[PDB]
Amino acid sequence: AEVTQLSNGIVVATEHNPSAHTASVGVVFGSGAANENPYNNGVSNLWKNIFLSKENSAVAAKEGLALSSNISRDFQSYIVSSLPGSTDKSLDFLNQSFIQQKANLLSSSNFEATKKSVLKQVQDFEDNDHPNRVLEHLHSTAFQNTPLSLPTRGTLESLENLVVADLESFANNHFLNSNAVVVGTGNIKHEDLVNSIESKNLSLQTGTKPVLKKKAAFLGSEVRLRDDTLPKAWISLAVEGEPVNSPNYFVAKLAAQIFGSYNAFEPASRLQGIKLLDNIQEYQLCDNFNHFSLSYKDSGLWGFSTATRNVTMIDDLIHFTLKQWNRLTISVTDTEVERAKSLLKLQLGQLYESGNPVNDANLLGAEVLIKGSKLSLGEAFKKIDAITVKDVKAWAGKRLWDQDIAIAGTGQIEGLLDYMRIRSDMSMMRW
């Protein structure tokens, strides 16, 4: 159990998994939505879709290859999956997609058709995916006029104004060697991959460095998208959280696990050791909720999202939740912290020990881009077990107690009270 990483101009990172019956090879760039501007916003999502374009997918399918691409805020990935014995065929495809060619996919017919498809996907997301649309607006308001505020899929306005030149322009500025990491996961040998890459010459294409921008900043604020025609109220609320590599990265995740997630329709979900559940189940304040600790390069967001049909009691839902958060600073119990440790280990285990090579490729690539390595699950578990009640209290005392919040909501949110009533609940009266 270990992760190897070598360099020679191109940084190669692999993670051999014997129990895997497939392999994934790809490139992860250290640039995402947070590297775009308001006007070209969605250009990365455009790249993802042309990579997954029918023409390109057909070539890959003929060789028994499957394509994957993920657009995030800090990173961007392009992965090719195949049987363990066809790892060579994956690299040949990857070489043709970035090095050998970089304008064949950008033909008028392919660009227009792809652009038309993403425009449809984004319009759909905006009209129908309320919980995710609300979470995207949380980022938009929390980090407004800052890089982290840009939605990963882009916006309809900027998307429809995008032309091939914008794609090429972005590719030239970000699809660079110094901003990339070739990853290999599943059944793969570090030596085989590093030698197959080193097999080809390609050395002249490099040297260039990506563009620099402004620093992400949190701003207490809110964006309300009331829609009385929707059957529920969907809201996300959060404070400034922890960036990746923060000394409190795990404490923040443990705190989120204390309140966790809930589904009113699942019998076992209603039996969880979460004190908040005693307050919200009596009058059934919501259908579901999920606490999170989103971490990025420059900042993060700690809070929760919830959906409810109880439109006349939203004030109680928010009040009880925030009152529980108050407890992290003054009265969180030893048992609550212990329960959270166990569940945090379980979530981390399921995230990192998945049987999916593409998931591992994304995780490996993203982590080696930020810290030049991937923290072992063993060392993560040890940090988690070391977290104390005092640690949680010190963290909440600086991050939660009487701190600004960002709020986003859509649907029947008339019952969601004004900003100050919510903001006041971030603390309690004391003597």
Partner: protein, 352 residues
């Protein structure tokens, strides 16, 4: 009482107790679903509440899944806690309380939730329909409980007796040491369970062809075709499903979904065309059928399907298909058809 387990130096492990008690074996419409929902409720010695609270403390979660073939009780947890989870799953099969209040307060409401969700998805209704007209009683049984046929507490208990037997289940473990798993299973109440019969049928199921059923529904329209497939003919249908949903086929952009449901005694190929506009569904389905009837070469999709069939690593008792290296051509013969939605403006089987 089969026991298998693949090991790994991981920190997380999964345990699965697969019981041949899916909807195909349901004595009454929906009983398999209700039993699935009863799993993890109170046992004679431990309440559902204590199970959840205890499992959270040591770091583990439980779930019971229902499909046409099985009722799978799964546990995901920290590796070293294996014995606890083996006994927990065993206690469910051997001694669930089955209290009347649990049926009314938790089971029925949860099953209503599942139905309500599925009820709004026309493709799931179309799939249920496809199974019903192609197989009828048995494999064609409804997956979920919709209450058309009343199911009592006793019916649920009777089905548990009929399905929870040593000969009707397989224990599987991932990232688990087989030696220990076998030892723990032998010490658990699993071995104390009665050794009934394996409900698995060896012979091929009776099927029907050229069948059609139409269902009015408010929402998206769906036209679907179902084809019963032989045990030996299932490899060519697997490649067909992947081919039809890949960039290798010109009609992939016309189909919402296509797949092959595989069982030990055969399978069912299903293809769905879904859209809010009935005219679009009509044109798409007509084009798909006409194209498939003309036939096509599935050879180019061989290496691709091999990769896709392999991405199912989580499955332990997976049906091996070395038959891939023999598939080439496909020509659409007889099939079954179901229209759901704006039925008055959807094609009839006669027109295809």
């Amino acid at each position: 009482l089969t026991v298998s387990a693949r090991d790994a130096p991981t920190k997380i492990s999964t345990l699965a107790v697969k019981v041949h008690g899916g909807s195909r074996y349901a004595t009454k419409d929906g009983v398999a679903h209700l039993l699935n929902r009863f799993n993890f409720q109170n046992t004679n010695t431990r309440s559902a509440l204590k199970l959840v609270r205890e499992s959270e403390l040591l770091g583990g979660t439980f779930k019971s899944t229902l499909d046409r073939e099985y009722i799978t009780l799964k546990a995901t947890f920290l590796k070293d806690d294996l014995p606890y989870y083996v006994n927990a799953l065993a206690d469910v099969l051997y001694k669930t309380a089955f209290k009347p209040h649990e049926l009314t307060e938790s089971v029925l409401p949860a099953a209503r939730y599942d139905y309500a969700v599925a009820e709004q998805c026309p493709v799931k209704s179309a799939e249920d329909q496809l199974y019903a007209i192609t197989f009828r009683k048995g494999l064609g049984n409804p997956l979920l409980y919709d209450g058309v046929e009343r199911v009592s507490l006793q019916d649920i208990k009777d089905f548990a007796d009929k399905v929870y037997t040593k000969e009707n289940l397989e224990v599987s473990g991932e990232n688990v040491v087989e030696a220990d798993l076998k030892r723990f299973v032998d010490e658990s109440l699993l071995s104390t369970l009665p050794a009934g019969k394996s409900l698995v049928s060896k012979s091929e199921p009776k099927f029907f062809l050229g069948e059609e059923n139409r269902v009015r529904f408010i929402g998206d329209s769906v036209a679907a075709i179902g084809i019963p497939v032989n045990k030996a003919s299932l490899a060519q249908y697997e490649v067909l499903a992947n081919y039809l949903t890949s960039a290798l086929s010109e009609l992939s952009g016309l189909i919402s979904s296509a797949k092959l449901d595989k069982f030990t005694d055969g399978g069912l190929f299903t293809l769905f065309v879904r859209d809010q506009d009935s005219a679009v569904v009509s044109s798409n389905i007509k084009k798909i059928v006409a194209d498939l009837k003309k036939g096509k070469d599935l050879s180019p999709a061989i290496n691709y399907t091999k990769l896709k069939n392999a991405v199912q690593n989580e499955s332990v008792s997976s049906p091996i298909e070395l038959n891939f290296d023999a598939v080439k051509d496909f020509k659409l013969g007889k099939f079954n058809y179901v229209a759901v939605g704006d039925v008055s403006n959807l094609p009839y089987l006669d027109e295809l």
